[PDB]
Enzyme design. Sequence first.
Site, PDB file in Angstrom:
ATOM      1  N   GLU A  11       1.420  -9.342  -1.136  1.00  0.00           N
ATOM      2  CA  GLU A  11       0.608  -8.363  -2.082  1.00  0.00           C
ATOM      3  C   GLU A  11      -0.864  -9.307  -2.738  1.00  0.00           C
ATOM      4  O   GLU A  11      -1.567  -8.797  -3.134  1.00  0.00           O
ATOM      5  CB  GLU A  11       1.491  -7.798  -3.245  1.00  0.00           C
ATOM      6  CG  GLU A  11       2.585  -7.174  -2.857  1.00  0.00           C
ATOM      7  CD  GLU A  11       2.115  -5.606  -2.340  1.00  0.00           C
ATOM      8  OE1 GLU A  11       0.741  -5.413  -2.199  1.00  0.00           O
ATOM      9  OE2 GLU A  11       2.908  -4.717  -1.818  1.00  0.00           O
ATOM     10  N   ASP A  20      -6.453  -1.260  -3.221  1.00  0.00           N
ATOM     11  CA  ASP A  20      -5.307  -1.654  -2.199  1.00  0.00           C
ATOM     12  C   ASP A  20      -5.699  -1.182  -0.581  1.00  0.00           C
ATOM     13  O   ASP A  20      -6.845  -0.740  -0.587  1.00  0.00           O
ATOM     14  CB  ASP A  20      -3.967  -1.288  -2.510  1.00  0.00           C
ATOM     15  CG  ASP A  20      -3.685   0.286  -2.297  1.00  0.00           C
ATOM     16  OD1 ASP A  20      -4.608   1.084  -1.863  1.00  0.00           O
ATOM     17  OD2 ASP A  20      -2.607   0.760  -2.806  1.00  0.00           O
TER      18      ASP A  20
END
Length: 164
Positions: A11, A20
């Site tokens: 991440e 994202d």
Amino acid sequence: MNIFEMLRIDEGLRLKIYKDTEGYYTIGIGHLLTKSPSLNAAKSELDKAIGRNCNGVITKDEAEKLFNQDVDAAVRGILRNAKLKPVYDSLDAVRRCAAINMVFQMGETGVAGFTNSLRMLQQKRWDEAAVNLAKSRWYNQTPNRAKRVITTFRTGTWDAYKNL
Ligand SMILES: CCc1ccccc1
């Protein structure tokens, strides 16, 4: 390696609101703020999550706190899910990390639909499960990460994450 190190690799860490892979406003270590197109909505969600007026930026300590909360939520979600819990309980420690990783990324209801893969994992048919897992939007949209997670399920080792 552990689930925190694994997800930190997958991440990353960003202290300012970013989008994202799916284009959603996110912050920290993959903490989803909102699926709304509105940056203002995301900033509001951030302020609510942190408990102060952040103006779109947080500290590393704050990011790590959200991360702890999110990992805990993922695990609890698995344990409360009647389809996920028995598979998770059947797994060894390393493969449990792969499971948490998927739920962290796509959420519990999402993975709970990975029905055929779940069966193969519970049956410890690792190569078969690995092949099935790759037949997914998940794999096609984020292939490098999916490959790491799948290798973890296939082997029960951290080989895909060594050398980051
Ligand atoms: C589909 C992988 C998995 C297994 C158990 C729990 C969550 C996720």
